[PDB]
Amino acid sequence: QDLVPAAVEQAVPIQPVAGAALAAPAAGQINQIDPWIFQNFVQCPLGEFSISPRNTPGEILFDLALGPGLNPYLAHLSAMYTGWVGNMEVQLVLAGNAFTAGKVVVALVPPYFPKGSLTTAQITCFPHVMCDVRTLEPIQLPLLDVRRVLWHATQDQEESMRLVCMLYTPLRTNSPGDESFVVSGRLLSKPAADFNFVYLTPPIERTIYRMVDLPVIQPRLCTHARWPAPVYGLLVDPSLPSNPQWQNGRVHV
Amino acid sequence: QDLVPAAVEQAVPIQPVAGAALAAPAAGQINQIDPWIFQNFVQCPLGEFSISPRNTPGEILFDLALGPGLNPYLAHLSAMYTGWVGNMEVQLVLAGNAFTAGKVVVALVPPYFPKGSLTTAQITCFPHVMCDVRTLEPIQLPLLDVRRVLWHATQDQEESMRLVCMLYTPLRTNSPGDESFVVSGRLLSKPAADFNFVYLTPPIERTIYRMVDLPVIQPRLCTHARWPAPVYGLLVDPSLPSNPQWQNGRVHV
Amino acid sequence: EASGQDLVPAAVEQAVPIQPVAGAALAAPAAGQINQIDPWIFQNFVQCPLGEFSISPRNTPGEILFDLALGPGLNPYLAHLSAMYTGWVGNMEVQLVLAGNAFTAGKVVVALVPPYFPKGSLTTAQITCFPHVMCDVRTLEPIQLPLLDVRRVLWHATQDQEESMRLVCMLYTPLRTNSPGDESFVVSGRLLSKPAADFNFVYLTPPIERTIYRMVDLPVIQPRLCTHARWPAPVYGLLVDPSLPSNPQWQNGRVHV
Amino acid sequence: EYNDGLLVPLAPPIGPFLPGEVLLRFRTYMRQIDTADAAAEAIDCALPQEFVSWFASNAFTVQSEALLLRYRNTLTGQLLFECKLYNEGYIALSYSGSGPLTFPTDGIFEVVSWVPRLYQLASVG
């Protein structure tokens, strides 16, 4: 005889990847990190997204990426080292009342996957864990380090195991006022059991993985960008052309 | 003394059926499959259905069927082999807010059952597991392989243990805007512990179990089917006869 | 056995000077998933996609006959499993069936050219400097020979990107026949191949539709029913004709493969 | 007429649609000779010939009862509608209004999955 239950936890399964056990020979040093970073989740840089009744099923909502730029400690220790190798763990938190139905699926896309279009029936063939937009408590996933080069290099922006999240079943509320009920969601992430940077280096303080800060100056004192006169006021207007092609005052981030 | 509780898990019970232990003698080979297919659910081909306030209690919602055409890996390995024998496991996911009440029952109809009308009181006498349209997490079932021929044959479309799902208690929402709140639902499926194809064979690439793909061409460039002139535009119209009997341009799938 | 032995039966894998090469034992701790390929693929040889070639007496010495690169595109299986997984490793074993009539001559050379070698000329002077094997175009049995995987990254990706140990041969000394009448025996070749002891795929991804190793499917409809591409009229018969100009530049019905 | 006035075996009329569905129509215009006006006669097929020469030369096997096609725009990737191709050779679409509604003609058709008869399509318009 036997008995197979009809409701089980999700529990994405893994097969561990080696961290600083492949890249110890061919790397100069292997640097530990403050072992109380491993112990609490913390909001990523990219940790903010929003579902909404205007999101057709298929729209990729947040596309994370393994690396030290997911945890503002590693994004800050990663200016003292020249490379990182190991795993991580991600956690997402949704926020919906009992009026919103619809599921999202988060899937650990591996590296070297052709970054194109993933239709809904194609996102779930990966390892994934399906959670719907009412759930209360956080839900977490192991972001492994499927790779082929021994240890990645921070200032290089290598290619590594992503984490994609598709709106599986269309989000739709019952019919009180809809269309204006963005279900916000946040992310967080912590180094896994086997993460450690790979060579010491002077903190160059001009590196990737540093959160942009805009100059703390009121827009009254600023100097305008198309006429030598102070900025006199900021405003929005849908009447004037909403797609101008000015030349000056045009810089990327 | 004793104590009998008043809320227990569902847990459809089984008595295992032999997979590749009956059909090893009378079959040429017995082929394993990539043992990381057994480890994650994945959306079936037929994995999409929808409940809605216009579904009287009794309407069969999704009628699956054991076979390699429930898991787009097996539906893709099954072009290299000539037969399959073993069990599988199915999981369904519903999506309802706290405004929709009503239960569905999924039942493992055996083979050689006269495919006719199943009234609600007749679907539950099978092994089943009753779940209602609010439930959050997935709910799964073991799809066994009750059979009488040793090993089925892929290109034959044998008869095997189905899986039916009837709207037990009529779905009805409270009275915000109803009648337009389709509760969508998805399916997924993974090979069970004892599934393995049965004879190797050149991948014929013209076989059953291959997902239809429509030609990627805009309907402007296409050639019309009732006059030698390019297709000039697609539209819907309820005024013109909605049941024409044209002869040309009439092909099945 | 056949009858008889005025042929030359090379049944032995000739000794190539190249060390063994580790396969999926350098990708086990860096591909977070267990994978194996059906153990009945390792048993019988089977023709590659590119399987056929011909050594006709007109082929001068130096014309590369078959230049096939190590990868999943060397079986009908390993090229049809490699639409699920993303990446491979490991060795391979390639046969070579060239059993020309007993009235022929001339020899070919097969050279395990390593990665990162500039594709292109590869003239008949620098095909022997590689670790090579010389075999006669009369050889009866199949001539096994390995195709190791020399690489500097753990496991290659399954997109055509990577560079792997090609296995190119070359018509070393030309095929010339000996029978006393009005015929030269074009020796046709075949190419069978099976994954080695530890070939293996790594990570399991969805079997995308427009993958890279779709062989080709030509539509199964008679030319009698098809439509012409230069006049709105059906096709009424196909034929060959040398009389008409044999190099036109019609600007209709002209698509690449 | 196919006989003089007698009957003739012919394909059944396109159906049946669920409550609230209509038939998508691939409409083209023809060479009309008349002196009434410039209302070019419009004839509408159920599938473009590029589909008939596709299903008849590929020979799939229908899984359950209908495919679920999404009419993704070619470049922006937005669902213009969500139609249901019944396997008997027509493309139903859950319309509600009373006047004709013309869609853009540069959308790439794409399947998402098989689906039974009872699937309640998301309404358009």
Short mmCIF file of N, CA and C in Angstrom, two decimals, chain B residues 2 13 25 28 51 62 66 77 103 105 146 149 167 172 176 212 218-219 236 246:
data_model
loop_
_atom_site.label_atom_id
_atom_site.label_comp_id
_atom_site.label_asym_id
_atom_site.label_seq_id
_atom_site.Cartn_x
_atom_site.Cartn_y
_atom_site.Cartn_z
N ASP B 2 -9.58 6.91 22.70
CA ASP B 2 -9.10 7.23 21.37
C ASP B 2 -9.37 8.71 21.13
N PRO B 13 -4.91 7.91 -2.10
CA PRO B 13 -4.06 6.74 -1.88
C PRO B 13 -3.93 5.86 -3.11
N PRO B 25 10.98 -7.84 -20.44
CA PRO B 25 11.16 -8.99 -21.33
C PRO B 25 10.66 -8.73 -22.74
N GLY B 28 12.30 -4.58 -26.69
CA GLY B 28 13.66 -4.66 -27.14
C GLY B 28 14.61 -4.04 -26.16
N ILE B 51 -12.52 28.58 -15.31
CA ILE B 51 -13.85 28.49 -14.71
C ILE B 51 -14.51 29.86 -14.81
N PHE B 62 -11.28 20.25 -17.68
CA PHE B 62 -10.09 19.81 -18.40
C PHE B 62 -9.94 18.31 -18.25
N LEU B 66 -2.99 10.28 -19.46
CA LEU B 66 -1.63 9.82 -19.24
C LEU B 66 -0.94 9.60 -20.58
N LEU B 77 11.18 14.10 -26.20
CA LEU B 77 11.92 12.85 -26.27
C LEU B 77 11.13 11.78 -26.99
N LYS B 103 -16.36 24.76 -5.58
CA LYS B 103 -15.33 23.73 -5.53
C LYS B 103 -15.27 22.97 -6.84
N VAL B 105 -13.69 19.18 -8.43
CA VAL B 105 -13.19 17.87 -8.03
C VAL B 105 -12.45 17.25 -9.21
N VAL B 146 -2.76 2.38 -14.80
CA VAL B 146 -3.63 1.21 -14.88
C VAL B 146 -3.80 0.83 -16.34
N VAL B 149 -2.24 -3.85 -21.56
CA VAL B 149 -1.15 -4.17 -22.48
C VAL B 149 0.16 -3.81 -21.82
N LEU B 167 -16.79 20.81 -12.24
CA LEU B 167 -17.19 21.90 -11.37
C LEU B 167 -18.22 21.39 -10.38
N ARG B 172 -19.85 30.92 -8.05
CA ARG B 172 -20.59 32.17 -8.04
C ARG B 172 -19.88 33.13 -7.12
N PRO B 176 -20.11 42.16 -6.44
CA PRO B 176 -19.56 43.16 -7.35
C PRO B 176 -19.74 42.67 -8.78
N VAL B 212 2.03 22.46 -32.38
CA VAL B 212 1.76 23.15 -33.63
C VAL B 212 2.40 24.53 -33.60
N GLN B 218 2.99 38.05 -41.39
CA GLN B 218 1.93 39.01 -41.14
C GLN B 218 0.76 38.76 -42.10
N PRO B 219 -0.46 38.96 -41.64
CA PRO B 219 -1.62 38.71 -42.50
C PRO B 219 -1.75 39.71 -43.64
N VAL B 236 -13.43 41.28 -37.32
CA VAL B 236 -14.59 40.55 -36.84
C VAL B 236 -15.83 41.39 -37.12
N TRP B 246 -18.75 28.47 -46.61
CA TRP B 246 -17.81 28.52 -47.72
C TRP B 246 -17.22 27.14 -47.95
#
